[PDB]
């Protein structure tokens, strides 16, 4: 299967796959079972922000989630990514939606890479941001009904002309270019990730989520990736 390494805003509580009974962050390694987890106090309607962190030397990959106003959501995972991701990658954001619903919609996202070697003046580095999206976005890989352009933003599941979030939706985005994460030289490899998003339901119960992510770059939908899968996983193991 594709490998994969993710940080989801998983909005539905599927306790029987090992969720918290509430929407919570959390660090996924190949399994949509997060290695780890911390509460989060979504808020319907409103722009929320996602910061991820990693770098080579501590190991260590960290998450933060923010609303205006509103006291932020924090999780870590110490992991050695070398151990875990090929040496070049993807990078992307995801989302679904299944019997219960919400908008995953983006504003905005960023990415920076870095590979810094012991060469005198040597840093490999990758960056890109994304404050509008268009119709026709060539650095982008859309993929299952992931769509730009309205109002300049990514909608990653499927919405209706006047709005409306559907369900059994599924959608990622993913970068055109290739990430380098490890070389055999380097001495400090980092990134980082931000990202707006917007989750809107009609429904007391939104579901399912949103997650960045990083993969193998050949990386698609898996087969039943709707729902509580977040378009990252082919089960639940
Ligand atoms: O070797 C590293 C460079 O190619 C970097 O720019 C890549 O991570 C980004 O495409
Ligand atoms: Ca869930
Ligand atoms: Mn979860």
């Given at each position: 299967?594709?490998?994969?390494?993710?940080?989801?805003?998983?909005?539905?509580?599927?306790?029987?796959?090992?969720?918290?009974?509430?929407?919570?962050?959390?660090?996924?390694?190949?399994?949509?079972?997060?290695?780890?987890?911390?509460?989060?106090?979504?808020?319907?309607?409103?722009?929320?922000?996602?910061?991820?962190?990693?770098?080579?030397?501590?190991?260590?990959?960290?998450?933060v989630v923010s609303?205006?106003?509103?006291?932020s959501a924090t999780?870590?995972?110490?992991?050695?990514?070398?151990?875990?991701?090929?040496?070049?990658?993807?990078?992307?954001?995801?989302?679904?939606?299944?019997?219960?619903?919400?908008?995953?919609?983006?504003?905005?996202?960023?990415?920076?890479?870095?590979?810094?070697?012991?060469?005198?003046?040597?840093?490999?580095?990758?960056?890109?941001?994304?404050?509008?999206?268009?119709?026709?976005?060539?650095?982008?890989?859309?993929?299952?009904?992931?769509?730009?352009?309205?109002?300049?933003?990514?909608?990653?599941?499927?919405?209706?002309?006047?709005?409306?979030?559907?369900?059994?939706?599924?959608?990622?985005?993913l970068f055109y270019?290739?990430?380098?994460?490890?070389?055999?030289?380097?001495?400090?490899?980092?990134?980082?990730?931000?990202?707006?998003?917007?989750?809107?339901?009609?429904?007391?119960?939104?579901?399912?989520?949103?997650?960045?992510?990083?993969?193998?770059?050949?990386?698609?939908?898996?087969?039943?990736?709707?729902?509580?899968?977040?378009?990252?996983?082919?089960?639940?193991?």
């Open positions: 299967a594709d490998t994969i390494v993710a940080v989801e805003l998983d909005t539905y509580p599927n306790t029987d796959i090992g969720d918290p009974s509430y929407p919570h962050i959390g660090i996924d390694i190949k399994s949509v079972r997060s290695k780890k987890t911390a509460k989060w106090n979504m808020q319907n309607g409103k722009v929320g922000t996602a910061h991820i962190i990693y770098n080579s030397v501590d190991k260590r990959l960290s998450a609303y205006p106003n509103a006291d999780v870590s995972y110490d992991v050695d990514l070398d151990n875990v991701l090929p040496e070049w990658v993807r990078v992307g954001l995801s989302a679904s939606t299944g019997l219960y619903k919400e908008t995953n919609t983006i504003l905005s996202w960023s990415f920076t890479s870095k590979l810094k070697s012991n060469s005198t003046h040597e840093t490999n580095a990758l960056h890109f941001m994304f404050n509008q999206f268009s119709k026709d976005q060539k650095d982008l890989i859309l993929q299952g009904d992931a769509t730009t352009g309205t109002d300049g933003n990514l909608e990653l599941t499927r919405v209706s002309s006047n709005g409306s979030p559907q369900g059994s939706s599924v959608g990622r985005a270019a290739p990430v380098h994460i490890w070389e055999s030289s380097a001495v400090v490899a980092s990134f980082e990730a931000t990202f707006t998003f917007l989750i809107k339901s009609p429904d007391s119960h939104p579901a399912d989520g949103i997650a960045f992510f990083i993969s193998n770059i050949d990386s698609s939908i898996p087969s039943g990736s709707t729902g509580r899968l977040l378009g990252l996983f082919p089960d639940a193991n």
